[PDB]
Design a protein around this ligand. Structure first.
Ligand SMILES: Nc1ncnc2c1ncn2[C@@H]1O[C@H](COP(=O)(O)OP(=O)(O)OP(=O)(O)O)[C@@H](O)[C@H]1O
Ligand SMILES: [Mg+2]
Lengths: 187, 209, 210
């Protein structure tokens, strides 16, 4: 049940980033509307700048945590599938890769990491046995639709807001810009 | 200050400007200045933008030195150490109100006029303001004005006044222009900026030239 | 108009055009100063001006444009080039630029470029996606160059002896070790004129130092 709520929060901050993009685009369209007019005053121009840079930093970090939440939910679902499907049918996997398994079970650290390397190459061969083979596949059977709505590849806007990243000092100064933005909103 | 310059100020700018001269005693300057600053703070209390111009900090400092009584303890150079707090009363009103309005002050300073007591007040007022502008005599000998010594000029947390990326842009320009001389920098800046109409075009031709 | 034709011309023709263009006291100074002042007054009249040269970039990124005839001298004949041309037009160091030039405004000693018309004998547009020199994989001297004139010249014997002793090839790496008074200078000039006469397609130049 944790995967479902994690997925729900993933769409929650996804939609948050979308609406942040919408209010950003509103900021630039208002900016261009004022630019196309007569710019007698520059204080409005300066505050429009301040807000558009602070909001673009905000949507940058929004895309960032949306991306990491997407990977988090993907890996938690993958590990849950591995755990329970092996709970169902792990005896065949055990009998298949037995040598390094007994190498791991009753031996020391050097033997264990050598066994990890052996199992790594063996499972790489096992995966490439069927990976190059051409077979139709379906999405995650437990949450197929749930995985189709989230999508494996994120939206192009996600990397549009992830292409540019500011320095940590610049990141904190945009954070303080967001703080003063909320301060003037309180005014 | 001489009445001719203050009357030129009166006749030039549309806004009203207060005046004082050597005819007015030092205590008169102190009291008119404190009404002026108190009125400015009362006005900015009503969420309004107020700007004050000071010419100069040394003249007022001399006036406050003259008017202060002797408290029994004297800072080196025959000046009352406590009295120095009173020019800071006329300078401490500079603050921006986040709820609305803001009070700003722009003050000039005078040094190297043959008086021993002028540079040290600048030294003890160095940390008072968040930005400063230097004027040098070698540019005056060079006869070209303004004698803006912007190479050593600096502001504390000026980022709040400009954007972010374009802030790093003029800082790139600043540290590019730092190593060269203070003179040729200002001539070629004013030469590039002279025949143009807006500073934005200056910004693009810094990416063009 | 094009400064190369008035640059390679001798001093007499330049000074005569100096008197006939309205400035008669421009003889007692350098060639670079003469051409600078003549072109200054010519462009002040408001006529078309064309330029060409080879560029270089200083430490600050702002670049100069020198001329081959002046032996790449840092005279007034050089032309200012901005780093912005490098950043968008994608022009590398030493690219031969020919095109429009701009008369410098007040406070600008050196000329500037309006637009570029030809880069390395090619269109400026396709010079952006040009492969670099070091990125090209090298090989050995595949091609062979013959130094024989073929006309039976009175001095062809030296070139024939050079060919017999050590044939030369394209893209080779060779040295000519020689003590002084070895006659090397004129044999290099002989092979230079030989390759100029036999091969009119390949570019030829000779570097003289001290
Ligand atoms: N093929 C040749 N035909 C006639 N004379 C020759 C030939 N090769 C060499 N010499 C003679 O060798 C001498 C070399 O003269 P030259 O000035 O060309 O030498 P250089 O090596 O270029 O000079 P340096 O080393 O002093 O700069 C001359 O006396 C020249 O006549
Ligand atoms: Mg020689």
């Amino acid at each position: 049940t944790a995967l479902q709520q994690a997925f729900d929060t993933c769409q929650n901050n996804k939609a948050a980033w979308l609406q942040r993009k919408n209010e950003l685009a509103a900021a630039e369209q208002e900016y261009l509307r004022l630019l196309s007019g007569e710019g007698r005053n520059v204080s409005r121009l300066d505050e429009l700048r301040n807000i558009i840079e602070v909001r673009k930093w905000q949507v940058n970090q929004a895309a960032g945590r949306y991306i990491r939440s997407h990977e988090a939910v993907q890996h938690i679902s993958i590990r849950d599938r591995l755990n329970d499907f092996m709970q169902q049918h792990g005896t065949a996997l055990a009998a298949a890769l037995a040598p390094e398994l007994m190498g791991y079970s009753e031996l020391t650290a050097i033997a264990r990491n050598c066994a990890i390397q052996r199992a790594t190459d063996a499972l790489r061969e096992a995966l490439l046995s069927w990976l190059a083979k051409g077979e139709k596949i379906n999405y995650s059977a437990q949450d197929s639709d749930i995985l189709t709505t989230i999508g494996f590849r994120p939206d192009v806007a996600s990397v549009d807001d992830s292409r540019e990243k500011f320095t940590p000092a610049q990141n904190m100064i945009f954070s303080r810009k967001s703080a003063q933005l909320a301060s003037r909103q309180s005014v | 200050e001489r009445p001719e310059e203050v009357t030129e100020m009166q006749r030039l700018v549309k806004g009203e400007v207060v005046a004082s001269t050597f005819d007015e005693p030092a205590s008169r300057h102190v009291q008119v200045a404190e009404m002026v600053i108190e009125k400015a703070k009362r006005l900015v209390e009503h969420k309004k933008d107020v700007i004050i111009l000071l010419d100069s900090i040394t003249r007022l400092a001399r006036a406050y030195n003259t008017v202060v009584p002797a408290s029994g303890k004297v800072l080196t150079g025959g000046v009352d150490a406590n009295a120095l707090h009173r020019p800071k009363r006329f300078f401490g009103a500079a603050r921006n109100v986040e709820e609305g309005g803001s009070l700003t002050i722009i003050a000039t300073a005078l040094i190297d006029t043959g008086s021993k007591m002028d540079e040290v007040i600048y030294e003890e007022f160095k940390g008072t303001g968040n930005m400063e502008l230097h004027l040098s005599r070698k540019i005056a000998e060079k006869r070209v004005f303004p004698a803006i010594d912007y190479n050593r000029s600096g502001t504390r947390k000026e980022e709040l006044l400009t954007t972010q990326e374009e802030l790093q842009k003029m800082w790139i320009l600043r540290k590019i222009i730092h190593p060269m001389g203070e003179i040729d920098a200002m001539e070629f800046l004013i030469n590039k900026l002279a025949m143009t109409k807006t500073n934005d075009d200056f910004f693009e031709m810094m990416k063009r030239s | 108009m094009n400064l190369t034709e008035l640059k390679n011309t001798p001093v007499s023709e330049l000074i005569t055009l100096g008197e006939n263009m309205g400035l008669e006291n421009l003889a007692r100074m350098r060639k670079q100063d003469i051409i600078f002042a003549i072109l200054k007054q010519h462009a002040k009249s408001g006529e078309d001006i064309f330029g060409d040269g080879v560029l270089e970039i200083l430490q600050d990124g702002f670049g100069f444009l020198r001329s081959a005839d002046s032996s790449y001298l840092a005279g007034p004949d050089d032309i200012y080039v901005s780093p912005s041309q490098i950043r968008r037009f994608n022009l590398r160091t030493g690219d031969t630029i020919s095109g429009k030039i701009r008369p410098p405004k007040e406070g600008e000693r050196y000329f500037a470029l309006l637009k570029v018309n030809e880069v390395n004998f090619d269109k400026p547009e396709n010079a952006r996606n040009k492969i670099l020199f070091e990125n090209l994989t090298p090989l050995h001297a595949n091609s062979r160059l013959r130094m024989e004139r073929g006309n039976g010249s009175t001095e062809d014997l030296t070139a024939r002896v050079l060919d017999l002793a050590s044939p030369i090839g394209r893209g080779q790496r060779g040295l000519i070790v020689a003590p002084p008074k070895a006659g090397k200078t004129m044999l290099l000039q002989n092979i230079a004129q030989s390759i100029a006469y036999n091969h009119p397609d390949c570019v030829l130049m000779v570097l003289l130092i001290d």
